[PDB]
Amino acid sequence: LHNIETKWLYDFLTLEKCRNFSQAAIIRNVSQPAFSRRIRALEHAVGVELFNRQVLQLSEQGKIFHSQVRHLLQQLESNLTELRGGSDYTLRKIKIAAAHSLSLGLLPTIVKQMPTQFTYAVEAIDVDQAVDMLREGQSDFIFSYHDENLQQAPFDNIRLFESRLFPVCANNGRGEPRYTLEQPHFPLLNYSQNSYMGRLINRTLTRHAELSFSTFFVSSMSELLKQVAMDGCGIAWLPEYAIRQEITDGRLIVLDADELVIPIQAYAYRMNTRMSQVAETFWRDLRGLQAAL
Amino acid sequence: NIETKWLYDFLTLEKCRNFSQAAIIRNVSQPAFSRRIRALEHAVGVELFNRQVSPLQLSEQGKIFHSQVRHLLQQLESNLTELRGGLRKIKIAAAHSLSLGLLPTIVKQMPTQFTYAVEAIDVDQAVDMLREGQSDFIFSYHDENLQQAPFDNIRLFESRLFPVCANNGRGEPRYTLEQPHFPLLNYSQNSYMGRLINRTLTRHAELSFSTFFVSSMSELLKQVAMDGCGIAWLPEYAIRQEITDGRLIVLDADELVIPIQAYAYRMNTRMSQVAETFWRDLRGLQAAL
Amino acid sequence: LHNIETKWLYDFLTLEKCRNFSQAAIIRNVSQPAFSRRIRALEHAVGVELFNRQVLQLSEQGKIFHSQVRHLLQQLESNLTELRGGSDYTLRKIKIAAAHSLSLGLLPTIVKQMPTQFTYAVEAIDVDQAVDMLREGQSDFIFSYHDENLQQAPFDNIRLFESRLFPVCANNGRGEPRYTLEQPHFPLLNYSQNSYMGRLINRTLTRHAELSFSTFFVSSMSELLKQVAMDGCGIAWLPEYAIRQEITDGRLIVLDADELVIPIQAYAYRMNTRMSQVAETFWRDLRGLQAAL
Amino acid sequence: NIETKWLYDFLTLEKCRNFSQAAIIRNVSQPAFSRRIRALEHAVGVELFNRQVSPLQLSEQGKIFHSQVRHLLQQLESNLTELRGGLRKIKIAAAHSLSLGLLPTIVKQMPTQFTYAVEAIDVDQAVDMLREGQSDFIFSYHDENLQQAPFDNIRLFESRLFPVCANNGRGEPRYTLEQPHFPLLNYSQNSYMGRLINRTLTRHAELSFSTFFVSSMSELLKQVAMDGCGIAWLPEYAIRQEITDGRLIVLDADELVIPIQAYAYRMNTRMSQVAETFWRDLRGLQAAL
């Protein structure tokens, strides 16, 4: 048996940083003799001499105990609030995987218009690991785009909303665009090669041979691409909802309306296997939300 | 061997489901389409389709090719666009908050032509890359292992964490810290921000709360808490606008305020001249960021 | 559209290593003019100049194409045999997670006495990630030890075999042990702190205060611990099956038979949710195998 | 705060399910056990049990503590044994083949007192650690990124891969390469050994096979193929015994033989004196390993 106490663990860490009994016993707002007895018992409880008393620092066995006390307390605290915060309610949280392109856009909108008898644990992923996470249950549901691989029989799905990709850029200052799609080697702002918008942008760029560009900037965040574009750096294919306000007031100007527009279709996916009671209620709750999106 | 038009001849075969129709949609005659398809079957040494058995559906050998002929073509279809886009990229992997605040100011002050490959990956995995490579510089918060031997650091700036929540109309916030079991918006244990708050939330017993929205994206908890879904600790630099117009009201600015110092790291290995210029130019921003 | 061919990709890599047309065209067993036409078309198909002809090396755009050709072909080959090797049969392979302590021991024994209408994809894990992999479907089944966490209602289980942990060490050369449990600070050979044998060894070591030791060697492989122990380096708690032969001939000598013996109980776990047809047959096939183990 | 005997007072509460019985099994009276339990409830601020409601079963707040009070105690119960076991450990993470062949010869030739912390982790994750730390030296095969700037290498030895399978009684192997659709024992695409064979298996068309046992552990495929379950490529140093007595017969020793050169890596960062002695002493083995 052992008699270790958390009091001594915090006093042990406070004694490591200051390396002085009386100087750090004051930090713990306790007397020096009672503080030394705390360390005395802690040296005894583990059965090893922690500090080497006369030089001041611990020995090698005390150095192994330090990294163990740190992560124990860091765990103890991070795990004390697992039952404090959340209680019984968050232990059935809706595991949601969302693509980096729509994660920030739709999750606040989805979580907002959803009852408060719920808890959400959201993960940010790429579209490649989208099919694996559903079968291997890392995420209960997922908010991604079109994919006939998992849109087939193995899965249940609800289409939320649709949108288009307009090639937009900043304005010169008069009302006309800062750049033109005709000019060669124009500054191109693309999504990351792993995002879903990335595959479509390259499909549409390569379809039109009259468009020579130079990749000026690449980011997997639709927010950063939108910020870089509207601040006069280049051109980018951006979703409608992110640029709907910046076009209404004239910040961004659409450069095309016919053959260079790419439509995106987002879907909420799930496996046909009937899940928990709480998630089946969410999936039912997700259908009535589709009309609002 | 294989050639790209054979896969496109095969990928289009279940795009529209017929030999003499895909050939119509692939601008080739029937003797061409069959030989361009059978030359693919011979090279791969696999029979994907049950030959002239029914209204065609490929065998189980074909589903695993169709499912990946996409994967293989999506890599070449995307990289030829990268092949035609060009100088030397700069591999940047940063947090969501540090990519929307630091980089836009950084892009305009750094020299004229560096092409940035901003990745914007959460800190728990952003710090994973720079330790194992595939990233030039990273804009992440404090890591003591990266302050040390094989890692350079730049003391970019310091900020503070704040329990904030959006008010409702003309008035003060909807939730408060003294309110019993308020909805909590917290990071995960894995990330750096989560450990700071999990440790801080423990030492204060008066905080009674119920976990509502757990995530690790820094900008996600900002927007979710920006509409009054719960109380969250957020960095000051990313939400200062909402404090000014009131859209986010700081609940407590005393004990629960957590210090944060965001740095910038490299691998201490100088193998690129454009990166070394960027690294030395990054120090110039530190004086007046 | 494009006209890229794999012929040119292998010729491109062969031209990178040798940096000479005629010198590496011979490596590909083709004439220099036809080889230059291969590179000529490959330079044309991607629309970018690969090599810079007059110095010999590629340009920056050719350097990005190199790392892409490499991983493409490496993928193409690694993925060509996904359908070649395995065909339809391995696409329903029994995902098996096995603890590092029993993975090598039981899997050959299990796979041996099991019909050949099966395919196995085995993963080696620690006992901590054992509970997560079953719910999050990374492994269809799992061969681990006792754990009342997942032995409760959420799971289906079949107990395979039982065994004990004997403290064994090498012989001095006469028939008596090389070490004694009484001598203080004896060379101790322990499992890793994450293995399941590790938790039991420390539970039993700490129960007896008359055993002072010094951790001489720690390995998560039962094979390496058994090799280190029987070659005269220290003492270790080792399973019966691994040391059953080395004791029969006198290589290892058991040091205890009463209060320092730890019994281990291995279980095959599964979730109560009825799985695939092929795995339910395996789970049924696993029961008739239990008596042989 | 918390103290270890309170958790053991709580962990034992559902070991045997009673207050005045766990107190009997914990060598304390009823007034002691209740106050030692209630002092834990107060400190954690959570009510785990429905107090005197039934034959006790803790609430949902207790299952998540019981499930982890084990986790927390299993870390302290294990480390105090590590606290009493001691000089300076040596963090070794190597492959399964390289840990059973190189290390036993290495333990006996290296100086008298280094305590080895052999981890024996597969190469795909063994190389992950040394790049990101938590490992002193690693015995892994060739990696060009680790031959380079921040990584030292030792040219330990070179070996070859062999298609082998165990014969049946007095005779020659059960399967051969010329046999149609023989059972294949192959590594995964992720590992280093798998890429070598996946690339090699492609360039030879005559090899008709069906994948049977896929894994990434090096010693696993040895033992499974050692009893005639399928054909596999295995390193020569780990199976040479079975070639001698015949327990494994090399099918082909011509084209399908794959070169492998196993090295040893460090981080080029000298922060330990015992490790530097081990590193310099490791070079002495290379001349006559």
Q: How far apart, in whole angstroms, are the C-alpha atoms of residue C149 and residue C158? A: 15
Q: What angle do CA C89, C94, C98 make, to 5 degrees?
A: 150
Whether residue C172 sits in one domain with residue C242:
yes
The DSSP letter of residue A26 is: T
Whether residue A103 sits in one domain with residue A65:
no
Using CB atoms within 10 Å of the CB of residue C93, give its burial: 0 to 12 exposed, 13 to 18 middle, 19+ buried. buried
Q: What residues contact residue D242 under an 8 Å CB cut-off, 6+ apart?
A: D164, D166, D226, D248
Which residues sit opposite A156 in a β-bridge?
A270
Q: How far apart, in whole angstroms, are the C-alpha atoms of residue C174 and residue A191? A: 73
Yes or no, beta carbons of C199 and D118 under 8 Å apart: no
Q: Do the beta carbons of residue D186 and residue D232 sit within 8 Å?
A: yes
Whether residue B23 sits in one domain with residue B59:
yes
User: Distance between the two ends of chain D, CA-based, in angstroms?
Assistant: 55
Yes or no, beta carbons of D145 and B131 under 8 Å apart: no
| HSE (side-chain half, CA atoms, 13 Å) at C172 | 7
Q: Of D55, D86, D117, at which residue does a domain stop?
A: D86
As a whole number of Å, the CA-based R_g of chain B is 27
Residues of A numbered 91-130 whose beta carbons fall under 8 angstroms of chain D's beta carbons: which are they? 91
Q: How far apart, in whole angstroms, are the C-alpha atoms of residue A65 and residue A50? A: 8
Q: Do the beta carbons of residue B99 and residue A219 sit within 8 Å?
A: yes
Contacts of A273 in chain C (CB under 8 A): 273
Yes or no, beta carbons of C135 and A138 under 8 Å apart: no
Whether residue D255 sits in one domain with residue D217:
yes
Give the count of beta carbons closer than 10 Å to the beta carbon of residue C291: 8
Which of C5, C6, C61 is opposite residue B83, by nearest beta carbon?
C61
Q: Distance of alpha carbon D101 from its chain centroid, rounded? A: 16
SS (H, E, C) chain C: CCCCEHHHHHHHHHHHHHCCHHHHHCCCCCCHHHHHHHHHHHHHHCCCCCEECCCCEECHHHHHHHHHHHHHHHHHHHHHHHHHCCCCCHHHCEEEEEECCCHHHHHHHHHHCCCCCCCEEEEEECCCCHHHHHHCCCCCEEEEECCCCCCCCCEEEEEEEEEEEEEEEEECCCCCECCCCCCCCEEEEECCCCCHHHHHHHHHHHHCCCCCEEEEEECCCHHHHHHHHHCCCCEEEEEHHHHHHHHHCCCEEECCCCCCCEEEEEEEEEECCCCCHHHHHHHHHHHHCCCCC
Which of C93, C205, C220 is opposite residue D214, by nearest beta carbon?
C93
B84 shares contact with chain C (CB less than 8 Å): yes
Three-class SS state of D49: strand
The DSSP letter of residue D196 is: H
Three-class SS state of D260: strand
Q: How far apart, in whole angstroms, are the C-alpha atoms of residue C76 and residue B75? A: 11
Q: What residues contact residue C282 under an 8 Å CB cut-off, 6+ apart?
A: C94, C114, C118, C141
As a whole number of Å, the CA-based R_g of chain C is 28
D82 to B241, C201, C203, C235, D118: CA distances (angstroms): 52, 12, 12, 16, 15
Report resolution in angstroms: 3.3
Q: Do the beta carbons of residue C282 and residue C156 sit within 8 Å?
A: no
Q: Which long-range contacts (CB under 8 A, 24 or more apart) does B275-282 make?
A: B275/B90, B275/B136, B275/B137, B277/B111, B278/B90, B278/B110, B278/B114, B278/B136, B278/B137, B279/B137, B279/B152, B281/B110, B281/B111, B282/B106, B282/B110, B282/B137, B282/B154
Residue D169: left if φ>0, alpha if ψ -120 to 50, beta else—which one? Answer: left
DSSP structure string for A116-174: SS--EEEEEE-STTHHHHHHTTSSSEEEEE--TTTSSTTEEEEEEEEEEEEEEEEB-SS
Q: Distance of alpha carbon D60 from its chain centroid, rounded? A: 35
Tokens standing for residue A150: 């998992």
Three-class SS state of B242: helix
Give the count of beta carbons closer than 10 Å to the beta carbon of residue D32: 13
Which residues sit opposite D241 in a β-bridge?
none
The DSSP letter of residue B257 is: -
Yes or no, beta carbons of B4 and C2 under 8 Å apart: yes
Tokens standing for residue C205: 């070591």
Touching chains, B (3+ CB pairs < 8 A): A, C, D
Q: How far apart, in whole angstroms, are the C-alpha atoms of residue D183 and residue C114? A: 14
Yes or no, beta carbons of B220 and A103 under 8 Å apart: yes
Q: What angle do CA C280, C282, C285 make, to 5 degrees?
A: 115
Q: Do the beta carbons of residue C252 and residue C243 sit within 8 Å?
A: yes
Q: Do the beta carbons of residue B115 and residue C64 sit within 8 Å?
A: no
Q: Distance of alpha carbon D136 from its chain centroid, rounded? A: 16
Q: Do the beta carbons of residue D107 and residue D126 sit within 8 Å?
A: no
Q: Distance of alpha carbon A119 from its chain centroid, rounded? A: 16
Q: How far apart, in whole angstroms, are the C-alpha atoms of residue C50 and residue C178? A: 68
Tokens standing for residue A83: 């039952």
| HSE (side-chain half, CA atoms, 13 Å) at C134 | 22
Tokens standing for residue C269: 């776990």
DSSP structure string for B5-51: HHHHHHHTTTTTT-HHHHHHHTT--HHHHHHHHHHHHHHHT---B-T
Q: Do the beta carbons of residue B4 and residue C2 sit within 8 Å?
A: yes
Q: How far apart, in whole angstroms, are the C-alpha atoms of residue D69 and residue A80? A: 10
Yes or no, beta carbons of D131 and B128 under 8 Å apart: no
Chain interruptions in chain D, by residue before each (C–N > 2.5 Å): 86
Helix axes B218-225, B236-244, angle to 10 degrees: 20
Q: How far apart, in whole angstroms, are the C-alpha atoms of residue B252 and residue B237? A: 17
Contacts of C121 in chain A (CB under 8 A): none
Whether residue D55 sits in one domain with residue D143:
no
A46 to A3, C191, D130, D238: CA distances (angstroms): 9, 21, 31, 42
Three-class SS state of B125: helix
Q: Distance of alpha carbon A63 from its chain centroid, rounded? A: 35
Whether residue C198 sits in one domain with residue C164:
yes
Three-class SS state of D224: helix
Tokens standing for residue D124: 């795909």
State which residue of chain B sits closest to C84, comparing Cα positions.
B46
Our CA-based measurement puts residue D76 at a distance from the nearest CA of chain A, in whole angstroms, of 8
Q: How far apart, in whole angstroms, are the C-alpha atoms of residue B142 and residue B155? A: 10
Q: How far apart, in whole angstroms, are the C-alpha atoms of residue C79 and residue A70? A: 45
Q: How far apart, in whole angstroms, are the C-alpha atoms of residue C187 and residue C170? A: 12
DSSP structure string for A239-286: EHHHHHHHHHTTSEEE--SSTT-EEEEEEEEEESS---HHHHHHHHHH
Q: What residues contact residue B69 under an 8 Å CB cut-off, 6+ apart?
A: B7, B10, B11
Whether residue B225 sits in one domain with residue B249:
yes
Q: Do the beta carbons of residue C145 and residue C99 sit within 8 Å?
A: yes
- Residue D29 has phi, psi (to 5 degrees) of -80, 175
Three-class SS state of D59: coil
Using CB atoms within 10 Å of the CB of residue B281, give its burial: 0 to 12 exposed, 13 to 18 middle, 19+ buried. middle
Give the count of beta carbons closer than 10 Å to the beta carbon of residue C157: 14
Whether residue D174 sits in one domain with residue D263:
yes
Whether residue C258 sits in one domain with residue C193:
yes
Q: Do the beta carbons of residue D94 and residue D125 sit within 8 Å?
A: no
Q: Of D70, D86, D102, at which residue does a domain stop?
A: D86
Q: How far apart, in whole angstroms, are the C-alpha atoms of residue A2 and residue D78? A: 13
- Residue C90 has phi, psi (to 5 degrees) of -85, -5
Whether residue D232 sits in one domain with residue D215:
yes
Whether residue B40 sits in one domain with residue B147:
no
Question: Is the torsion defined by CA of A119, A123, A124, A130 positive or negative?
Answer: negative
A277 to A280, A281, C122, D86: CA distances (angstroms): 5, 6, 33, 53
Q: How far apart, in whole angstroms, are the C-alpha atoms of residue C267 and residue B275? A: 54
Which residues sit opposite D163 in a β-bridge?
D233
Q: What residues contact residue D162 under an 8 Å CB cut-off, 6+ apart?
A: D233, D234, D235, D236, D239, D250, D251, D252, D253, D257
Q: Distance of alpha carbon B195 from its chain centroid, rounded? A: 21
Which among A132, A98, A110 has a CA at the least distance from the CA of B217? A98
Q: Do the beta carbons of residue B104 and residue A228 sit within 8 Å?
A: yes
Q: Do the beta carbons of residue C265 and residue C225 sit within 8 Å?
A: no
Q: What angle do CA A190, A243, B126 make, to 5 degrees?
A: 45
Which among A230, A236, A240 has a CA at the least distance from the CA of A213? A236
Q: Of C87, C106, C140, at which residue does a domain stop?
A: C87
Contacts of D45 in chain B (CB under 8 A): 205
Tokens standing for residue B89: 């990229």
- Residue A116 has phi, psi (to 5 degrees) of -90, 10
Range of the domain at A145: 88-292
Q: Which residue has the tokens 């719910």?
A: C135
Q: Do the beta carbons of residue A135 and residue A256 sit within 8 Å?
A: no
A85 shares contact with chain B (CB less than 8 Å): yes
Which among B141, B144, B257 has a CA at the least distance from the CA of B200? B257
Residue C22: left if φ>0, alpha if ψ -120 to 50, beta else—which one? Answer: alpha
Q: Which residue has the tokens 């009937």?
A: A274
Which among D146, D154, D99 has a CA at the least distance from the CA of D121? D99
Q: What residues contact residue C37 under an 8 Å CB cut-off, 6+ apart?
A: none
Q: How far apart, in whole angstroms, are the C-alpha atoms of residue C189 and residue C226? A: 9
DSSP E strands: which ranges in chain B? Answer: 89-94, 115-118, 137-140, 152-153, 157-165, 182-187, 209-215, 231-235, 249-250, 258-266
Touching chains, D (3+ CB pairs < 8 A): A, B, C
Whether residue D248 sits in one domain with residue D145:
yes
Three-class SS state of A53: coil
Q: Max CA-CA distance within chain B?
A: 80
Yes or no, beta carbons of B268 and D150 under 8 Å apart: yes
Give the number of domains in chain A. 2
Q: How far apart, in whole angstroms, are the C-alpha atoms of residue C78 and residue D200? A: 9
Q: How far apart, in whole angstroms, are the C-alpha atoms of residue C17 and residue C21? A: 11
A249 to A151, A234, C36: CA distances (angstroms): 38, 19, 56
DSSP structure string for D104-139: HHHHHHS-S--EEEE----HHHHHHHHHHSS-SEEE
Give the dihedral of Cα atoms A251, A257, A259, A262; nearest 10 deg: 60
Q: How far apart, in whole angstroms, are the C-alpha atoms of residue C143 and residue B108? A: 57
Q: Which residue has the tokens 């220099």?
A: C32
Touching chains, C (3+ CB pairs < 8 A): A, B, D
State the best of C88, C95, C122, C148 to mutate against chain D, taking most chain D CBs within 10 Å: C122
Residues of A numbered 211-270 whose beta carbons fall under 8 angstroms of chain C's beta carbons: which are they? none
